[PDB]
Design a protein around this ligand. Structure first.
Ligand SMILES: Nc1ncnc2c1ncn2[C@@H]1O[C@H](COP(=O)(O)OP(=O)(O)O)[C@@H](O)[C@H]1O
Ligand SMILES: Nc1ncnc2c1ncn2[C@@H]1O[C@H](COP(=O)(O)OP(=O)(O)O)[C@@H](O)[C@H]1O
Lengths: 420, 420
């Protein structure tokens, strides 16, 4: 369980390597005056992998490891926790420099608490005793533990970025017999926000779906379809859609994808489907990012707003009678335009100011000029999505009639059709 | 542990010297009628160093010292605290004039409380019994303890000013083997708001970082880099920034430093770096004050506001497309301009009045004249930062191309480049 078995956190490893060294040659840290801390506090979102790091460092240099959970101290009989703690340190002091882990310390931090503080102060840091604490919350902790001599050194763990998830997938798939067409980079970019714990569950679910039919390999189709069942839900083939009502959905989704391709700034589409899924959903479009970005320009916000108004601009041109389907793409397209004006200061009339944060302190004369700008930004974009559709209309029907039988179209075919 | 080992508080020492004298010649205070108090209450922010003063005064004249913590009285069995208190005074009365310290009295101030008040009133102040109490909160204390005869004399401790931190650093670094280029005045001015407890931790962390590589001296580079890891966090070299996206940050930070140098009133820069650090940060600039000030003029507030609008005025002139990076320098530059008008009364139209403190009691006709002034102060400054940049443009590119390879530039090189 060396450091080669943990991936996705290069700042909790490089920073936490001298502790291994300190357990090898403690003479280097006494010639100067170093006072290597007795306790280490790991903090981060739950499920990040805090517990695995302690096991990894314990196994890095052959050393006994004693794991104790603070949840076990909950609802224990009076005095049992104190006796367990005393026996733990009694065992620890008998052996060589050891590693002791205490988990879930937020809940504990009454009788066992005070006994812990006194007993911790008893032994010396030169014996070889290391205490590692892992909390899911840094605020509800007991303030007394933050005093010097107690837990004072903290390590922050963070969710992985794009390259971290690739490494985690590489780690967790070594044993299983993958097929020959499985690409782990594609599956790495379609899973943003996943903590390291969920990817193993994803692999297990893909294995289950591969095993249901019965076959010794896991193909790409199992991976891609297993991701959808986690985000939205299982497919619902029992639902019945009227033939004159599924023609509207075919035009509402084939218009959101034509507009999102013509405009310069955007991310490419992956597939379009109209199979119902989950509760209150009738069709979706998927994008895959090209890289990871941290700064957003202005022209990249006027083209994410035109795409959202693409579906509503396709019903109006074709049918002429607007439906109630596009009620969530209007709510999310009007708070994008209320940040370009109030907070980010990208309006040429109100200047570089931050009107807002209770949550409203300004006059009524000003409040009637923010609306004349919001209603002008949104209307100006909605007049351009309609203009885009009118050019690509003969090539918009072809995308529909293909989508009304196969019920799914791929991105490459779409981009081949648009560019005749 | 005499007074020579405590620095940074010259008002809790000069005021607390006759207590040492009173324990030497108590005859001077009885010829007139002095009734030197039995209890002394030390109040101040936590970690200021209240506990150290009691030990210092106890060691000033050779006298037994008995320390008891009020946190120990918490969750003790019924009657144990009273027995401990009785045994404490029983031991104290047997010896010469002694010193007894009670810590953390805010939590205690039920059964032990009443026993303390009665037993305190028992003995006489002429025996040589002194009681020192240290609380972190002056409001939650039991009001009964404020009656005469009980704790009535209080001493307030305060965080050190600029010269105090120098003395604390001098005290805590005597043993350790510093290098020859370490300047303690520079490190004293870059640590505002630090209480006396944090500087020793800073020294220990610098020692750790010096020891990691292995060398018998601590150079300046270890001190300066150890301060950053406390304020913001460790460097994150795993983060990847697109080549076309780190060119924007190089222009946003090289513009905030050119403007902050040309304007008359300001504090000099120290270094510019674009290495990511912490969470949601992509570049920072550091200043070092020349001295400590307590009054701020008006012209010193119109030049701290032009500097903040320097980054946004560098993207607009160069690229022409404003990004979302400068969203925190707009929020902090619009509450500076809402104090020059409402509270401080530095507006020539609304006169010397204080509109405001619920938090709003005035008409709507007035509320529409504060905005016409706020929008005029901010816009007038933003038209001048752009004017500054246009002059120093040939000398703004040189600062960038140097900053795109070394990833760090020093203040002296910047001020040499600007003044050709
Ligand atoms: N960086 C990582 N590399 C590989 N696997 C990880 C990583 N982080 C977390 N995991 C996986 O996530 C799972 C959950 O870990 P767990 O101990 O529950 O986290 P925590 O203790 O922080 O809740 C572990 O089985 C581990 O395999
Ligand atoms: N004025 C000072 N001079 C030198 N060291 C100080 C001073 N004030 C505080 N310290 C240091 O801060 C540390 C914390 O003191 P502590 O007793 O915890 O403060 P408090 O009791 O007020 O919380 C001590 O180890 C002491 O060395």
């Amino acid at each position: 369980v060396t450091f080669k078995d943990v991936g996705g956190a290069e700042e909790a490893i490089e920073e936490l390597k001298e502790v291994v060294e300190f357990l090898k040659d403690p003479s280097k840290f006494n010639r100067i005056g170093a006072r290597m801390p007795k306790g280490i506090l790991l903090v981060g979102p739950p499920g990040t992998g805090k517990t695995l790091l302690a096991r990894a460092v314990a196994g890095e240099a052959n050393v006994p490891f004693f794991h104790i959970s603070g949840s076990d101290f909950v609802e224990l009989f009076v005095g049992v926790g104190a006796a367990r703690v005393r026996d733990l340190f009694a065992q620890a002091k008998a052996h060589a420099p050891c590693i002791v882990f205490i988990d879930e310390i937020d809940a504990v931090g009454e009788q066992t608490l005070n006994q812990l503080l006194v007993e911790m102060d008893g032994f010396d840091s030169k014996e070889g005793i290391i205490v590692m604490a892992a909390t899911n919350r840094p605020d509800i902790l007991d303030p007394a533990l933050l005093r010097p001599g107690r837990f004072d050194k903290k390590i922050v763990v963070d969710p992985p970025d794009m390259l971290g998830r690739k490494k985690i997938l590489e780690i967790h798939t070594r044993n299983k017999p993958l097929a020959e067409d499985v690409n782990l980079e594609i599956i790495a970019k379609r899973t943003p926000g996943f903590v390291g714990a969920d990817l193993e569950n994803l692999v297990n679910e893909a294995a289950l779906l591969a095993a249901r039919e019965g076959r010794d390999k896991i193909t790409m189709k199992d991976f891609e379809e297993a991701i959808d069942r986690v985000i939205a839900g299982p497919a619902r083939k029992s639902k019945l859609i009227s033939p004159k009502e599924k023609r509207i959905i075919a035009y509402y989704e084939a218009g959101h994808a034509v507009v999102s391709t013509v405009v310069p700034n955007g991310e490419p589409v992956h597939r379009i489907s109209i199979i119902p899924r989950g509760y209150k959903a009738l069709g979706y479009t998927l994008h895959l990012p090209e890289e990871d970005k941290y700064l957003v320009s202005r022209n990249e916000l006027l083209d994410k707003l035109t795409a959202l108004l693409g579906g509503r601009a396709a019903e109006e041109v074709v049918f002429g009678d607007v439906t109630s389907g596009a009620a969530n793409d209007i709510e999310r397209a009007t708070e994008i335009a209320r940040n370009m004006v109030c907070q980010l200061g990208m309006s040429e009339e109100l200047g570089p100011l931050a009107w807002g944060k209770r949550l409203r302190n300004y006059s009524e004369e000003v409040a009637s000029k923010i609306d004349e700008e919001v209603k002008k930004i949104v209307t100006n974009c909605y007049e351009r999505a309609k203009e885009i559709i009118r050019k690509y209309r003969k090539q918009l029907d072809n995308i529909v009639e293909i989508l009304l039988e196969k019920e799914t179209i791929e991105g490459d075919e779409l981009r081949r059709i648009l560019s005749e």
